[PDB]
């Protein structure tokens, strides 16, 4: 009872991530430390500096702090000057305490003053309909959005002076576009902070052909994307069968898309809500169901799988 | 247009409030000011001083701030004393902008933005099952909970050295008992902030004979109390009658208590689930609906009110 878990996450874990914030808290792999709840920060940095390949002056800790809009992002440590604070206190009594560990490769890490801000750059690609992590960036707050564009272009492997559209990933389901690039970061972003995320893409008529042209639309898609498991009632011990749907979808839409997978009519399907989580089918869905898929999967606990049972109907008696 | 509403609410409006936070947002009375969005704060203080009838030195503004934890509380003024800062800037574009106004007699003590905290004091009376506003206090953060107990007794009209059980009203349906009284304020409370509320009661076995022995039970009970209005779907304008229920109630309970009010059997009543966002009934509601009344009504807004239709039948 006198120890705590400190979890370290490193920037490579942010690569390939396709959702909101930097990584998926469940699926990411952490580097873990048992630490005395009365430990010193310098004492932890020492242990960390030996365990990892990096010296103390080539690393920087950004504790992963939750925010009031439901986001969890790298934040600034509240050390600075005469602190002498204890680990468990620095964590505000959180245990485990997760921390983003900034290092360098392949030299010394820059200095960070507060008139500076750390930002995270993501590049949305409407062709592939995927996000591409482009690292992070120290910059004075006084700097103007236009002055970052070369670094976004470069990091996304674009030619210089490629025309880009910039959004701020604010929270899940809110991606505000940055309108005027000729203002400073504090004015350009909604509420400037060190975890803030600019997503960017090419301004190009060629990406109107794609399923989701703008980043803003992409995040709206992810927000509603949900993967449901379809099991046949007449076949007991059936695993499924997994389909990707929206909360938004109504009965016809759910029906026609499951039908385009089972290779049958949507009129020959008979679904059953529901179980959260007293597993097993229940009331059969009338095909005039006025609700939507969000309503059908309402009773499920958050970290549980979504199962809906179905039945194939006869086409001749 | 280039004008914003600024609603002042005075500490007299917190008295008798029987729920979470300081006042009922709907039922409270405001003094309303219409101000240029570009005004100085100085100008507002001048006109507020003129209107309300207090000198600028006897007043203090605590803008009300709606939180994502489900509470609205007084907050420290933002002004970086006071680099321009227009009123609409100070409100984060919020229109209207509500502000708790602190006066004095019917002078005001200095408050260190960095080292002092303003806390609110409620007293729960388990006998009557009622909350009693006991005002607000300025205290150092370093100060220990132990040292506020005398003040809590005084304001509730208790004798000194009266035993008290302390809670923090964190948010609706969350009232955390304070265990150690010999720690600082910042240690004792969850996230110390101006506008934090601690509720206290006598430590007396007598009140265990109450239907709701503690504040914890009281607020939990309040979270569940919910009013819903029932109307006949066939086919008038709206013969509305609203009856008090719990959020914990399942189908049987809600039916048996609405059927009893109409005089019929529950088997005669057919509830239709509220379409939600859309206009009318639509769906019929199954009598084997395994959910609660909380689940039936989570479509309805926070305004709100709560209502759902029925044939009878």
């Amino acid at each position: 009872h006198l120890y705590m878990q400190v979890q370290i996450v490193a920037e490579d874990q942010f690569c390939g991530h396709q959702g909101n914030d930097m990584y998926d808290e469940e699926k990411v792999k952490y580097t873990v430390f048992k630490v005395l709840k009365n430990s010193s920060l310098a004492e932890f940095v020492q242990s960390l500096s030996q365990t990892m390949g990096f010296p103390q002056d080539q690393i920087r800790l950004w504790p992963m702090q939750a925010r009031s809009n439901g986001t969890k992002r790298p934040a600034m440590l509240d050390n600075e000057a005469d602190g002498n604070k204890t680990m468990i206190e620095l964590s505000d009594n959180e245990n485990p305490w997760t921390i983003f560990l900034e290092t360098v490769d392949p030299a010394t890490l820059p200095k960070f003053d507060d008139h500076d801000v750390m930002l995270f750059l993501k590049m949305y690609d409407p062709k592939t309909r995927s996000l591409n992590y482009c690292g992070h960036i120290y910059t004075p707050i006084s700097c103007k959005i236009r002055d970052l564009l070369p670094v976004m272009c470069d990091r996304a492997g674009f030619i210089q002076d490629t025309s880009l559209i910039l959004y701020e990933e604010v929270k899940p389901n809110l991606t505000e576009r940055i309108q005027d690039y000729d203002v400073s970061l504090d004015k350009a972003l909604d509420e400037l902070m060190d975890g803030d995320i600019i997503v960017f893409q090419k301004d190009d008529p060629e990406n109107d052909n794609s399923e989701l042209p703008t980043a803003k639309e992409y995040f709206r898609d992810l927000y509603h994307r949900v993967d449901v498991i379809f099991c046949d009632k007449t076949i007991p011990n059936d695993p499924g069968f997994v389909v990707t749907l929206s909360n938004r979808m109504n009965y016809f839409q759910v029906a026609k898309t499951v039908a385009q997978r089972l290779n049958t009519d949507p009129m020959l399907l008979q679904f059953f809500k529901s179980q959260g989580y007293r597993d097993g089918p229940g009331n059969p869905l009338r095909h005039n169901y006025e609700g939507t898929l969000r309503d059908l999967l309402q009773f499920f606990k958050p970290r549980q799988p979504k199962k809906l049972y179905y039945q194939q109907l006869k086409m001749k008696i | 247009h280039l004008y914003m509403q600024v609603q002042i609410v005075a500490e007299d409006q917190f008295c008798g409030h029987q729920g979470n936070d300081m006042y009922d947002e709907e039922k409270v009375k405001y003094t309303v000011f219409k101000v240029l969005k570009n005004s100085s704060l100085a100008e507002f203080v001048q006109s507020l001083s003129q209107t309300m009838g207090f000198p600028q030195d006897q007043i203090r503004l605590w803008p009300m701030q709606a939180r994502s934890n489900g509470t609205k509380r007084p907050a420290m003024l933002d002004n970086e004393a006071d680099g321009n800062k227009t009123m609409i800037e100070l409100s984060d574009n919020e229109n209207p902008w509500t502000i708790f106004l602190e006066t004095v007699d019917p002078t005001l003590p200095k408050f260190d933005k960095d080292h002092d905290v303003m806390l609110f004091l409620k007293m729960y009376d388990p006998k009557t099952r009622s909350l009693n506003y006991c005002g607000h206090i300025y205290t150092p953060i370093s100060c220990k909970i132990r040292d506020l107990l005398p003040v809590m007794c005084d304001r509730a009209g208790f004798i000194q050295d009266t035993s008290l059980i302390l809670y923090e009203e964190v948010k609706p349906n969350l009232t955390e008992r304070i265990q150690d009284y010999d720690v600082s304020l910042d240690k004792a409370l969850d996230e110390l902030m101006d506008g934090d509320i601690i509720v206290f009661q006598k430590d007396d076995p007598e009140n265990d004979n109450s239907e709701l022995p503690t504040a914890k039970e009281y607020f939990r009970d309040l979270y569940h109390r919910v009013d819903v209005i029932f109307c006949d779907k066939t086919i008038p304008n709206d013969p509305g009658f609203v009856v008090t229920l719990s959020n914990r109630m399942n189908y049987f309970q809600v039916a048996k208590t609405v059927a009893q009010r109409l005089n019929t059997d529950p088997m005669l009543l057919q509830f239709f689930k509220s379409q939600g966002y859309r206009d009318g009934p639509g769906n019929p509601l199954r009598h084997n609906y395994e959910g609660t009344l909380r689940d039936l009504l989570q479509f309805f807004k926070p305004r709100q009110p709560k209502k759902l239709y029925y044939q009878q039948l």
């Binding site: 925010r67 | 953060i141 964190v170 304020l185 910042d186 110390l192 902030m193």
Partner: peptide, 11 residues
């Protein structure tokens, strides 16, 4: 000992 700036225990 200092005051927090923002809350955290959400709806």
């Amino acid at each position: 000992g200092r005051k927090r700036h923002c809350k955290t225990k959400h709806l």
